Structure 1
Amino acid sequence: GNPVICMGHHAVANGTMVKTLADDQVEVVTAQELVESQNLPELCPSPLRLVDGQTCDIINGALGSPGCDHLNGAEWDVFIERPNAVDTCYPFDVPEYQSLRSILANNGKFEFIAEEFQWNTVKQNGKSGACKRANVNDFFNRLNWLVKSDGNAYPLQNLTKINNGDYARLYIWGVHHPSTDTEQTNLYKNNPGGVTVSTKTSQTSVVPNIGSRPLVRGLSGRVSFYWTIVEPGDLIVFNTIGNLIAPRGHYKLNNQKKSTILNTAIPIGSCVSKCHTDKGSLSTTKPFQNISRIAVGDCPRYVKQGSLKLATGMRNIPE
């Protein structure tokens, strides 16, 4: 007795190194990479709705700066905001800048609703050389610059807008800051001016801010922008003795806010993907990625490791 039968297993010439609990380098016959480290050099316009701000960041798009009319009515899952956006209007600031940018981005649409405010005797629709629209003096097309009547008269203003609609409203309004008391007086008569905006449930008051300021777009003046959200059943009251940059109306808020914003220079292309990083879209089934912590949509999880190999076969012991 002398025939022989042997039980064995396959092997290949050169396998892949993996880690276990015990060992940092075990060679197995096959493995699969679980960390995505490649991205597309473009953003995928499908199946998520991307809106490109192009020259406007979202705050300028909301205010209605020159160059941002293409954003009117826009609806998005992800607002694409370009690093090389540029101000095209009157020099401004937003005291809670990131909070407003978040609210607009989250909300996910620019659905503006015109209302008429019957401002008393004050002159409306002020414009500026720092806000040119087709080489003509203009302004944020969502705001309304008020100044004294031609016969020096900026009376106390007192208008109310009631919300009986079935959705919350976002009013964006502002306050103008002259650089001298002489400027103050020729614009708004009174000195000091002042704005106070109120709801059933809150109240705000801004004292305008006069002083020398660096020249931005050839001006020392500024506009500080604020916002007020008005729920159904609530009301908003505007009060002015000068310096108000008034709203032309309100933006609609979605009940459910599911959208967001992504700041990147990366061009929008023709691919399909539901995962967007600021370095571009990801086209992968892997459960992890090391490309960017900034990621939006249906993404692999971001991790620090550049590689994690999952064994998909047995130990490789050739010959």
Structure 2
Amino acid sequence: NNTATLCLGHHAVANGTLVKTMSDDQIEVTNATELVQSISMGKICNKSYRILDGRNCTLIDAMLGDPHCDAFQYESWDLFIERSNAFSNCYPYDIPDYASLRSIVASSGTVEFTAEGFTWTGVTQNGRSGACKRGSADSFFSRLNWLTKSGSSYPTLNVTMPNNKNFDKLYIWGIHHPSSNQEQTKLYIQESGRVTVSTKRSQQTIIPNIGSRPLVRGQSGRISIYWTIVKPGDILMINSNGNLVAPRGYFKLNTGKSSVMRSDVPIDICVSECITPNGSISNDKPFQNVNKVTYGKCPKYIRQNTLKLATGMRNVPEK
């Protein structure tokens, strides 16, 4: 022409997404990105972390030595998975602070037992029960040693075991609770029983509890578990005139990345770095809405299930 004209402007698209700002609740922009992980992978993934599958075993059953948990005997892990359909099948027990001992063992990352030469003179060892079957007939927890009378007596046991290693040992032991006053004397002569486990720094004495209970695998007796930690330089000592269920050794305790998690989801071949009861989840988003229980490199769990972050300008299609 005689003169010219120059016009400025920005671009736009077809598929504008709505997002939230401080000035408006909804507003169209050229692109947006999802910040909350809603979808899980629907399977727990055997990489990058090491995971053990509890299957029929709970963690405490595996580390005590339930006959149907002999496959776990030598296993360590990054994450142990407890299935809900899991059960016990050995002598009926209880553990004061079960939750704590579960945490302490779950953290260690292993149930690998070290045997040690304990000497129980004047008593008879390796007691078994019809509740706790292995192969055919009677058996017992493989990490505990049920001590009964030898002939006419059960003399006071007084056995010492020093810790010259450079690491904290964890001894597991228990006490037996006979059904009746008739059992208490039949097994461990003395009308009353007692177990006093002590180190230089602390102690626990536990009295038995004669009484009839409901039947579990034909048995009305029970057994209680206590644990005791022995430090480097320190020394384990066990005094008892009856009802002791002795340790056969110690578990090594570890500062570790290990843990335990309840889930009923199948473990599959794949690679992933965050785990929830719902399965593995993708790592890449900063937040997540699958589960507040997470193990590994996990986005933070939040109550929202969608938060769109704007990665583009305002979108004005031609009106």
Which category describes the TM-score, using the shorter chain as reference length?
over 0.9
- Return the alpha-carbon distance in structure 2 between the equivalents of residues 199 and 257 of structure 1: 25
- Return the alpha-carbon distance in structure 2 between the equivalents of residues 257 and 300 of structure 1: 21
- Return the alpha-carbon distance in structure 2 between the equivalents of residues 257 and 185 of structure 1: 45
Secondary structure in structure 2 of the residue aligned to 1:134: coil
- Return the alpha-carbon distance in structure 2 between the equivalents of residues 136 and 264 of structure 1: 33
Deviation track 1:287-308 (CA, whole Å, cap 9, x = no partner) reads 0110000001000110000100
Matches within 5 A, 1:188-203: 188-203=188-203
- Using the size of structure 1 for normalisation, the TM-score is 0.97
The letter for the 1-side match of 2:16 is G
- Return the alpha-carbon distance in structure 2 between the equivalents of residues 42 and 16 of structure 1: 31
Residue 123, structure 1, aligned to residue 130, structure 2: no
- Return the alpha-carbon distance in structure 2 between the equivalents of residues 197 and 258 of structure 1: 30
Secondary structure in structure 2 of the residue aligned to 1:44: strand
- Return the alpha-carbon distance in structure 2 between the equivalents of residues 24 and 138 of structure 1: 68
Question: How many Å apart are 1:13 and its aligned residue?
Answer: 2.7
The letter for the 2-side match of 1:5 is L
- The answer to whether the Cα contact below 8 Å between 2:283 and 2:297 also exists between their aligned partners in 1 is no
Which residue of 2 is the match for residue 160 of structure 1? 160
Question: How many Å apart are 1:284 and its aligned residue?
Answer: 3.4
- Return the alpha-carbon distance in structure 1 between the equivalents of residues 25 and 153 of structure 2: 81
- Return the alpha-carbon distance in structure 2 between the equivalents of residues 14 and 42 of structure 1: 33
Which residue of 1 is the match for residue 243 of structure 2? 243
- The answer to whether the Cα contact below 8 Å between 2:16 and 2:28 also exists between their aligned partners in 1 is yes
Question: How many Å apart are 1:218 and its aligned residue?
Answer: 2.1
- Tell me which moved more, 203-212 or 5-14: 5-14
Secondary structure in structure 2 of the residue aligned to 1:152: coil
Deviation track 1:120-141 (CA, whole Å, cap 9, x = no partner) reads 1211000001001123210000
- Using the size of structure 2 for normalisation, the TM-score is 0.97
Q: Which runs of 5+ in 2 are unaligned?
A: none
Which residue of 1 is the match for residue 252 of structure 2? 252
Matches within 5 A, 1:36-185: 36-149=37-150, 151-185=151-185
- Return the alpha-carbon distance in structure 2 between the equivalents of residues 178 and 288 of structure 1: 54
- Return the alpha-carbon distance in structure 1 between the equivalents of residues 271 and 16 of structure 2: 34
The letter for the 2-side match of 1:133 is R
Deviation track 1:173-218 (CA, whole Å, cap 9, x = no partner) reads 0000012100111111111111110001001010101112111222
Residue 267, structure 1, aligned to residue 270, structure 2: no
Secondary structure in structure 2 of the residue aligned to 1:241: strand
Secondary structure in structure 2 of the residue aligned to 1:106: helix
The letter for the 2-side match of 1:157 is L
Question: How many Å apart are 1:24 and its aligned residue?
Answer: 1.3
Which residue of 1 is the match for residue 221 of structure 2? 221
Secondary structure in structure 1 of the residue aligned to 2:145: strand
The letter for the 1-side match of 2:100 is S
Which residue of 2 is the match for residue 306 of structure 1? 305
- Return the alpha-carbon distance in structure 1 between the equivalents of residues 248 and 15 of structure 2: 71
Which residue of 1 is the match for residue 211 of structure 2? 211
- Return the alpha-carbon distance in structure 2 between the equivalents of residues 194 and 229 of structure 1: 20
The alignment of Structure 1 onto Structure 2 pairs a total of residues equal to 317
- The answer to whether the Cα contact below 8 Å between 2:194 and 2:243 also exists between their aligned partners in 1 is yes
- Return the alpha-carbon distance in structure 2 between the equivalents of residues 317 and 218 of structure 1: 78
- Return the alpha-carbon distance in structure 1 between the equivalents of residues 298 and 181 of structure 2: 55
Cα root mean square deviation, aligned: 1.1
The letter for the 2-side match of 1:298 is K
Question: How many Å apart are 1:68 and its aligned residue?
Answer: 1.3
Deviation track 1:134-175 (CA, whole Å, cap 9, x = no partner) reads 2321000000000011x2211000000001012110100000
- Return the alpha-carbon distance in structure 1 between the equivalents of residues 89 and 109 of structure 2: 23
Question: How many Å apart are 1:54 and its aligned residue?
Answer: 1.6
- Return the alpha-carbon distance in structure 2 between the equivalents of residues 219 and 111 of structure 1: 29
Question: How many Å apart are 1:2 and its aligned residue?
Answer: 4.5
